[PDB]
Amino acid sequence: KKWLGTPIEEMRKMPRCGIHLPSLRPSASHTVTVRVDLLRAGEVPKPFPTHYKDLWDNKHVKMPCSEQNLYAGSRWELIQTALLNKFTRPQNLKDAILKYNVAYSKKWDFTALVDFWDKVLEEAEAQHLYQSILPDMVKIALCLPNICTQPIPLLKQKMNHSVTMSQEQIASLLANAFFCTFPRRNAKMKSEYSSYPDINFNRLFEGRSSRKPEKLKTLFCYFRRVTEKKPTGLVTFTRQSLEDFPEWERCEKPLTRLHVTYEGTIEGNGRGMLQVDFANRFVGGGVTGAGLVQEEIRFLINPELIVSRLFTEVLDHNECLIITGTEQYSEYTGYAETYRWARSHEDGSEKDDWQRRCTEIVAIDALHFRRYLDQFVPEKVRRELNKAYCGFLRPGVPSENLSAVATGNWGCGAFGGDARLKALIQILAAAAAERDVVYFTFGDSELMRDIYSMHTFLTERKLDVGKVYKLLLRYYNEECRNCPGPDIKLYPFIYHAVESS
Numbered sequence: 001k002k003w004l005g006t007p008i009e010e011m012r013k014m015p016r017c018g019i020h021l022p023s024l025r026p027s028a029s030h031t032v033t034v035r036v037d038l039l040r041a042g043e044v045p046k047p048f049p050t051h052y053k054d055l056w057d058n059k060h061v062k063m064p065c066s067e068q069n070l071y072a073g074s075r076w077e078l079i080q081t082a083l084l085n086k087f088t089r090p091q092n093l094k095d096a097i098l099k100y101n102v103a104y105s106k107k108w109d110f111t112a113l114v115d116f117w118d119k120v121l122e123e124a125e126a127q128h129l130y131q132s133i134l135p136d137m138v139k140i141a142l143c144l145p146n147i148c149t150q151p152i153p154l155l156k157q158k159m160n161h162s163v164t165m166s167q168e169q170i171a172s173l174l175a176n177a178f179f180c181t182f183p184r185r186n187a188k189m190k191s192e193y194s195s196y197p198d199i200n201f202n203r204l205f206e207g208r209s210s211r212k213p214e215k216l217k218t219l220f221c222y223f224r225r226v227t228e229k230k231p232t233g234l235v236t237f238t239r240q241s242l243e244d245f246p247e248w249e250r251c252e253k254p255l256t257r258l259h260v261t262y263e264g265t266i267e268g269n270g271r272g273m274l275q276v277d278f279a280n281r282f283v284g285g286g287v288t289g290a291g292l293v294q295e296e297i298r299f300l301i302n303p304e305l306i307v308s309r310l311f312t313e314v315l316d317h318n319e320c321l322i323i324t325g326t327e328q329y330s331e332y333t334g335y336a337e338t339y340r341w342a343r344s345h346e347d348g349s350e351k352d353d354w355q356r357r358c359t360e361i362v363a364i365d366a367l368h369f370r371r372y373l374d375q376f377v378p379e380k381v382r383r384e385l386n387k388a389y390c391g392f393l394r395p396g397v398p399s400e401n402l403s404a405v406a407t408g409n410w411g412c413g414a415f416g417g418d419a420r421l422k423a424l425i426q427i428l429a430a431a432a433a434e435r436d437v438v439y440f441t442f443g444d445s446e447l448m449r450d451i452y453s454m455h456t457f458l459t460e461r462k463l464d465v466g467k468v469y470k471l472l473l474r475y476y477n478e479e480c481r482n483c484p485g486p487d488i489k490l491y492p493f494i495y496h497a498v499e500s501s
């Protein structure tokens with residue numbers, strides 16, 4: 001038996017369950033970088049305004065094309081002069097990039113880049129990269145000031161704000177990231193941007209990791225498609241931050257429906273559902289660097305997610321980033337050290353009334369546990385409930401229009417968490433948000449069954465979240481607090497504690 005619970009066909013998914021959308025427009029809480037009066041199916045969006053407007057502030061992105069990006073001396077014009085040379089070898093790209101990054105000439109290794117070029121790529125491919133792709137990338141990179149003509153706000157901690165943007169605009173930005181043109185983004189001592197993730201792609205060219213080329217394949221697949229064929233969709237990046245959370249002890253809301261399976265993945269089989277990304281608080285994690293786990297894979301196969309790093313400040317405990325409309329340009333076999341680029345992916349997902357694809361991804365960072373038992377402390381249980389709930393909550397949205405949540409072993413690989421606790425927590429969080437849950441256990445068939453049995457057990461006995469929470473609190477005190485290893489595990493205890501009275 002490959003799955004358990006309520007069948008996946010009965011779960012709500014977009015666009016079916018979606019609300020009627022209000023007309024897209026700019027507001028104090030919503031930056032829209034395109035012309036909404038023109039927005040139209042299968043036609044590349046027009047940027048608003050028509051001509052570049054610059055801001056060099058602590059409130060907006062610092063664009064490379066700004067007349068205030070200086071090295072007098074226009075670094076932008078330095079960047080143009082550098083990239084407009086012809087690249088016949090890897091070192092020409094190294095030198096080019098290092099022309100406007102002279103402080104890092106002996107700190108940025110480019111060995112991975114040369115290996116992908118000379119060894120892993122065959123001559124017919126290597127030729128295609130420097131004759132078609134690279135010069136095509138440079139054109140869209142230098143078109144930035146004609147395409148990203150509206151300053152881009154930074155999504156800082158505590159801001160509840162959305163930025164909606166064209167896929168074409170995303171492309172030009174990411175192109176700039178590749179060639180490492182974003183100023184004041186590379187220091188260590190750092191100024192402004194210590195609390196923001198890396199955006200420049202320098203670390204992607206470092207060292208002798210065997211995975212490094214496969215990432216380069218994955219991003220070039222994306223850089224190929226959008227250069228050869230411009231995409232026409234919009235993407236929304238929404239930072240959400242709550243100041244008030246459910247009193248979990250006294251919450252009276254019932255548990256929702258579950259579908260659990262050890263077959264499939266969030267991206268593959270959570271189509272048109274709220275797909276959870278298991279983030280680092282610096283969203284995207286080490287996608288640019290040496291990370292190649294769930295989030296980073298997701299950021300690579302949906303490379304438009306990466307740009308979020310340009311403007312999304314590290315998430316606080318009460319925050320998440322919702323991304324709606326990113327497109328999948330690659331497929332993958334493997335995981336981490338076994339990850340391979342396998343195939344260009346043709347996405348056939350329906351776009352909504354704002355021309356965003358009906359893919360909604362939410363980044364929520366679990367906590368990272370040194371030790372096992374630390375997670376059962378109420379504080380930590382409460383934190384994770386709050387993070388997930390924020391992840392799932394759509395304030396002012398009727399539940400009958402919320403899709404189900406496609407999630408899995410959140411926090412339970414790199415971050416040391418317990419799958420059986422975190423499953424339950426997300427089940428508690430989703431119930432508070434009145435959403436249904438589709439759980440992917442990622443091969444673990446015993447976990448599928450334990451979560452099923454648990455959910456099934458709790459539903460029978462008509463326990464509201466408050467009662468299921470109070471049990472988790474009871475587990476800590478009676479069995480975790482005074483513990484050489486806790487005597488009974490979480491699930492056997494709940495079965496005992498419920499049946500014992």
Ligand SMILES: Nc1ncnc2c1ncn2[C@@H]1O[C@H](COP(=O)(O)OP(=O)(O)OC[C@H]2O[C@H](O)[C@H](O)[C@@H]2O)[C@@H](O)[C@H]1O
Pocket residue numbers: 264265266267278279280284285286291292293294295296366407408409410411412413414415416417440441442
């Ligand atoms: N495509 C998938 N679909 C469903 N489930 C998956 C998938 N991929 C992995 N899993 C399961 O989900 C588990 C998650 O293990 P993890 O990917 O490490 O996320 P974390 O919260 O533990 O740690 C995230 C950190 O690592 C990153 O660098 C971030 O930036 C953070 O810094 C796997 O063991 C799988 O069972």
